[PDB]
């Protein structure tokens, strides 16, 4: 530790709230970080005096592991396969010794790679060589699943924790997080590394590089070591950052060690992933004493997801846990893997909690955080041969005597059928009929949007398309010499620009390439990337599913970001006396085949569209004629619409199956074609179709089958009291059932149990495996709620883990900063201890802020000043002599946060600046007589601010390309996009009108003519960068750093002209003693205070922002926000309504509603959030979980408290300033640590008119 303090005295003292931060100290610490070596870090590790309580036995079995030979074999198809010893799932990487396959590396004799000679015999065709190389490559891939070498994170943790305990500015005391001497994971890490290294002078068990990994030549090295080290470092970081109980961390370490000592680490983790949940969350509050439960109400329409908060209700023994006990299952699971002890202490600790408070939820969160967080890795061949080889089990099938004659490929289903499929058919029938009747379906722009939706810069298995087309003697343009990837769907569309549908008809039956994704605590997922014609013909399915999900059921569309989901749903469902049922469909994609579902949905869609669509083309697909055989005897021909043509072709494809192409890069000689019936995951219709069928089947059960299959009157009454429009919420294969508490308490658990048995039975006869959980807890979209408190799952945000599925090398240097900031924000959302988290984030930002480069003997160092991170949203600790820990990470990012913190500490900044000799004579409106123009330059603050905005990815634009080929590419793309002449005429009219009127006001009018250029740029940027582009990066950053500046951007200079006035605090939004988010508690002051002052966002964000736009959807390639900003800029700058009409015509809106909307927008008044986007003001991502709307409305007063002032007058026609200034007030109030505070406008230096002129000047000058 002596060298640690010696090297980082100033830095630690600065980032621990003792001394002011400065750029020079930051850069010195960065240089020191760059100057260490691995063994130096381990020698530093040797000096921590670990205490006895951090001691635990390590089994000797980990070091001694057998060879890999017995775990693999060769099938009859000459493909390498994994021998299974533990069951059907033992197909992961075994735990075997490796050192006997390593060739020593030059100049690094202690380390080596996989033998190249073995690679030679492997590529020749040898069996043993193939086995060995497969094992080696898969072990390398498993070890490559991290973001950066672990030593960086370990050293950063050491530096951060060397500062000791932190002082709480709110609590006015010191935290009591135990120091590193009680961190068991670090002790285990050090001991295992030392034992592996032994006498050899090098300590790193392996070396992680971009090109791959090099293994240490030790006879104790095992393939299972890297994941074990990753888990240990994650746990060590989490314990020190979130104040975890060391007792639970020890159990987590025990689980990790047991996993290492087993035959397969990944398989073991997979099979034992649920000890912590099943023993803490699912068995909680067996005997209840008291506490609070929030009182929420579900308003009408429930389709609107409108919930309103009432208050707290005291709990009682009446609402103790009533779900069936799971003790036997937990004990059996613990026994089957030799962890019965850990289960014993888990249960014993769980029984100790009798009150529902912050303590219990904190304990639950800590217990859940101890699960391992590795990305499970297995070879693609086993994934394919394990996931596509199971099929649905239709236990009760549709009788064959219930079908009509074929219509091409489809077959109509009779109405006399005793099967339950009739209701599914009826639902899809009505859905299709209602869909086809919408006039917007026939609008050319809607069809263009749908066509463009699946035209993206991602892969589409274009090669198989190519030989499929060659199979019928059709040659596509090659576009030789284009510096773009041919393996993109944009390339496919360009090659398919001017071909008739009849020529491309065969292309749907082509093959499908491969694609994999690894997940945490979940088997790797496979993907089928359908090609362009398949996506085109899959449209009606998607449209019908969209209609069902939008209208006939309760279904969300939120992403996996925690902010955008429906927290109110979960918190309402978990709160007693309501009870929740968690329903999931196992292997959902594999359970939907032609046998039961597809044969019915396809027929229903085909029939429910003929009327509203007869004789019309669609999406480029024309009408056609098919044979008719429905009626007996008579066999005739029948015209069909374009949608029906697509349905016929898609029915052909569904009946045949799927042709997956595999090329296992980790296995030489493992490539083939696999015939499967599994529904594709890569198509656009997956999630919507799955949700629609989920809702339909649930409704069918609740209405017909279920009432007819149970006789217990209580079950009948319950089921008759439940409907999907009131009680069921579904998304894909995940669903949630809400049981509303009765007036006599809560529904009897036995009735719920028998009903669950009924659903379990009902799922089988159409081959659906219903994974049902009923344990007094609510889970939805991997969000966990108990008694109205949401429990963040830390383990699913691995700090060091990163998903890598391919063999490609990793990214250039600057990219990692995005990942680091993402880790910081993930910790922000997960609710870690804010002071420790900020300190640790600063440590990491320092450790990654320097990079060596070679410029041809110009050996320079790239260095980011500390200010760039602040611009990126990372809060400060203490600067300019101010008090420490006065800022909160609810600080906005970009210009807003900068303005906020300058506004908070402007006077101190000025006094500090003057006291240091930075004195001038020109009085400044912002800084008085301070010589800021030079202090900012020498403090690199201007430099950091400006270089924080440079694109930290390589810009593949500007590559040399022939004029002829480039123009051919662009015209082909435009020809593909502009099919219907009506749209082209509309765009031409828009261009002419814009030239007549709107030309000269703004320089970048969005238009449909720019889509081909954006597509070309996106395809070009998708290619692999080369060295000179990286040199372009380096020289650009050096140019930015060496330059000298004089001001920020115009917008920030405008912002600084505004000053405010803080006042008395707000009123509490919720009760102070009600747990809402676990960990957000009094020991976590600032988040707790912000949450109780502002209040949680009690309304889903997707629907809230759905109304903050004019056009709901646009063509893929253009941004709706860009169009809105352009329209509002045109309105603000005084352009007349014809300019707005022209702009609306460019994006393809038809003339009449173009005029209507233009006039309405011109005269309308818009929301604050929507209006603020003219200056690129967006709500900070961290605010999403808070009620910012009410604080905008009734807590940012634009009138001075003492009365009207002279400068605070807004010109009548500049009312949008009312929208902007609200954001400035919000930033100022949220940045400050503590409670939310009512804020009043104070003064604008130049007056309202001058500010308006400056803003309009910026609005006009941008886009040049």
């Amino acid at each position: 530790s002596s060298m640690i303090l010696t090297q980082f005295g100033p830095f630690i003292e600065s980032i621990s709230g003792i001394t002011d931060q400065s750029n020079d100290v930051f850069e010195d610490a960065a240089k020191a970080f760059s100057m260490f070596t691995r063994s130096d870090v381990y020698k530093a590790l040797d000096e921590i005096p670990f205490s006895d309580d951090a001691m635990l036995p390590i089994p000797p079995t980990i070091y001694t592991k057998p060879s890999h030979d017995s775990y693999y074999y060769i099938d009859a198809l000459n493909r390498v396969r994994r021998k299974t010893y533990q069951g059907p799932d033992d197909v992961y990487v075994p735990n075997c010794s490796i050192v006997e396959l390593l060739e020593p590396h030059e100049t690094l004799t202690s380390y080596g790679r996989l033998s190249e000679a073995i690679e030679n015999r492997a590529k020749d065709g040898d069996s043993q060589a193939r086995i060995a190389t497969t094992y080696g490559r898969i072990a390398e891939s498993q070890a490559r699943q991290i973001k950066a070498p672990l030593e960086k994170f370990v050293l950063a943790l050491l530096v951060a924790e060397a500062g000791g305990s932190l002082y709480d500015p709110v609590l006015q005391k010191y935290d009591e997080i135990p120091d590193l001497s009680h961190n068991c994971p670090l002790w285990c890490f050090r001991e295992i590394c030392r034992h592996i290294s032994g006498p050899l002078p090098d300590r790193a068990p392996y070396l992680y590089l971009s090109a791959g990994v090099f293994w240490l030549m030790s006879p104790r090295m095992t393939s299972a070591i890297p994941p074990l080290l990753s888990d240990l470092v994650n746990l060590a970081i989490l314990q020190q950052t979130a104040g975890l109980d060391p007792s639970l961390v020890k159990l987590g370490v025990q689980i990790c060690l047991h996993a290492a000592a087993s035959s397969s680490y990944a398989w073991f983790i997979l099979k034992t992933k649920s000890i912590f949940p099943q023993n803490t969350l699912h068995s909680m509050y067996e005997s209840l004493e008291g506490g609070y439960c929030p009182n929420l109400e579900w308003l009408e329409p429930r389709s609107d997801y409108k919930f309103m908060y009432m208050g707290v209700m005291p709990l009682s023994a009446k609402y103790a846990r009533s779900a069936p006990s799971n003790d036997k299952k937990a004990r059996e699971l613990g026994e089957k893997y030799g962890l019965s002890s850990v289960v014993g202490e888990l249960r014993k600790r769980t029984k100790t909690y009798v009150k529902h408070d912050f303590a219990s939820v904190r304990y639950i969160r800590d217990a859940m955080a101890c699960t391992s967080g590795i990305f499970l890795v297995r070879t693609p061949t086993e994934t394919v041969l394990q996931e596509y080889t199971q099929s649905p089990e239709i236990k009760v099938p549709i009788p064959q005597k219930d079908w009509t004659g074929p219509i091409g490929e489809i077959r109509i289903l009779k109405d006399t059928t005793s099967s339950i499929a009739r209701y599914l058919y009826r639902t899809w029938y009505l859905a299709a009929a209602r869909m086809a009747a919408q006039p917007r379906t026939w609008d050319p722009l809607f069809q263009a949007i749908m066509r463009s939706q699946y035209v993206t810069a991602r892969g589409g298995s274009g090669a198989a398309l190519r030989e499929s087309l060659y199979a019928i003697n059709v040659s596509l343009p090659d576009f030789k010499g284009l510096p773009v990837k041919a393996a993109t769907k944009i390339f496919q569309a360009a090659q398919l620009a001017n071909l008739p549908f009849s020529h491309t008809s065969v292309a749907i039956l082509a093959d499908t390439s491969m694609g994999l994704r690894n997940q945490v605590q979940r088997r790797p997922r496979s993907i089928m990337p359908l090609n362009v014609p398949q996506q085109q013909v899959s449209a009606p399915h998607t449209l019908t599913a969209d209609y069902i999900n939008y209208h006939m059921n309760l279904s969300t569309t939120s992403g996996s970001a925690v902010i955008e989901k429906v927290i109110p749903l979960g918190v309402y469902a978990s709160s007693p006396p309501n009870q929740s049922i968690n329903i999931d469909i196992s292997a959902c994609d594999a359970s939907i085949t032609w046998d039961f579902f597809l044969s019915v949905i396809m027929a229903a869609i085909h029939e429910g569209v003929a009327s509203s669509s007869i004789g019309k083309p669609f999406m480029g697909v024309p009408a056609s004629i098919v044979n008719d055989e429905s009626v007996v005897g008579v066999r005739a021909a029948r015209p069909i619409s374009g949608m029906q043509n697509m349905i016929q072709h898609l029915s052909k494809l569904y009946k045949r199956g799927f042709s997956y192409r595999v090329n296992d890069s980790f296995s030489p000689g493992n490539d083939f074609t696999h015939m499967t019936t599994t529904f594709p995951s890569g198509s656009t219709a997956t999630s919507t179709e799955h949700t629609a069928n989920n809702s339909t089947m649930m409704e069918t059960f609740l209405t017909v089958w279920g009432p007819e299959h149970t006789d217990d009157p209580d079950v009948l009454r319950l089921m008759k009291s439940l409907t999907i429009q009131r009680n069921y919420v579904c998304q894909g294969d995940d669903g949630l059932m809400i049981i509303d508490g009765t007036t006599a308490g809560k529904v009897n658990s036995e009735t719920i149990q028998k009903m669950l048995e009924l659903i379990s039975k009902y799922g089988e006869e159409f081959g659906w495996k219903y994974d049902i959980a009923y344990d007094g807890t609510a889970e939805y979209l991997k969000l966990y709620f108990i008694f109205g408190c949401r429990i963040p799952n830390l383990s699913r945000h691995p700090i060091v883990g990163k998903e890598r599925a391919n063999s490609s090398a990793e990214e250039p240097w600057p990219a990692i900063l995005d990942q680091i900031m993402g880790v910081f924000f993930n910790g922000v959302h997960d609710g870690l201890q804010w002071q420790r988290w900020i300190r640790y984030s600063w440590a990491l930002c320092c450790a990654f802020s320097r990079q060596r480069t070679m410029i041809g003997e110009s050996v320079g160092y790239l260095q980011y000043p500390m200010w760039s991170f602040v611009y990126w949203g990372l809060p400060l600790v203490k600067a300019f002599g101010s008090d420490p820990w006065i800022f909160s990470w609810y600080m906005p990012t970009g210009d807003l946060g900068m303005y906020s913190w300058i506004s908070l500490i402007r006077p101190l900044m000025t006094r500090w600046m003057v006291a240091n000799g930075y004195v001038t004579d020109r009085c400044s409106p912002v800084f008085g007589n301070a010589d800021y123009r030079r202090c900012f330059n020498e403090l690199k603050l201007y430099q950091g601010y400006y270089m924080a905005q440079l694109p930290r990815n390589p810009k593949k634009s500007g590559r040399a390309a022939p004029r002829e080929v480039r123009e051919q590419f662009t015209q082909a793309l435009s020809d593909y996009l502009m099919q219907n002449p009506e749209l082209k005429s509309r765009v031409l009219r828009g261009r002419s009108e814009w030239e007549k009127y709107g030309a000269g006001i703004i320089h970048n009018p969005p238009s449909l003519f720019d889509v081909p250029h954006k597509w070309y740029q996106g395809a070009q940027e998708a290619a692999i960068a080369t060295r000179e582009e990286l040199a372009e990066m380096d020289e650009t950053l050096m140019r930015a750093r060496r330059h000298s500046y004089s001001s920020f951007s115009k917008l920030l200079e405008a912002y600084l002209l505004v000053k405010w006035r803080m006042c008395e605090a707000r009123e509490p939004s919720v009760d102070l003693r009600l747990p809402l988010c676990a960990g957000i508690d009094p020991l976590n002051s600032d988040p707790f205070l912000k949450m109780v002052s502002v209040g949680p966002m009690l309304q889903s964000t997707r629907k809230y922002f759905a109304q903050t736009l004019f056009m709901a959807k646009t063509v893929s390639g253009l941004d709706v926000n860009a169009i809105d900003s352009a329209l509002l800029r045109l309105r603000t700058l005084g352009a007349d309504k014809k300019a707005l009409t022209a702009q609306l015509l460019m994006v393809g809106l038809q003339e009449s509603e173009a005029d209507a909307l233009a006039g309405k927008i011109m005269l309308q008044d818009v929301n604050t959030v929507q209006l603020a986007r003219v200056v690129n003001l967006a709500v900070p991502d961290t605010w999403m979980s808070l009620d910012f709307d009410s604080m905008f409305k009734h807590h940012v007063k634009l009138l001075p408290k003492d009365g009207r002032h002279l400068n605070t007058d807004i010109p009548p026609r500049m009312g949008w300033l009312r929208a902007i200034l609200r954001f400035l007030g919000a930033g100022m109030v949220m940045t400050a640590t503590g409670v939310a505070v009512d804020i009043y406008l104070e003064d604008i230096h130049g007056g309202g008119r001058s500010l308006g002129q400056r803003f309009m000047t910026w609005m006009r000058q941008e886009g040049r």
Binding site: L171, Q172, L1083
Partner: peptide
């Protein structure tokens, strides 16, 4: 030594809050 508890940690902060 001084590994007192987590519930008392929670309660001590709250007691700091209520004081006025």
């Amino acid at each position: 030594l001084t590994s007192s508890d987590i519930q008392r940690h929670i309660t001590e902060f709250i007691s700091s809050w209520q004081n006025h």
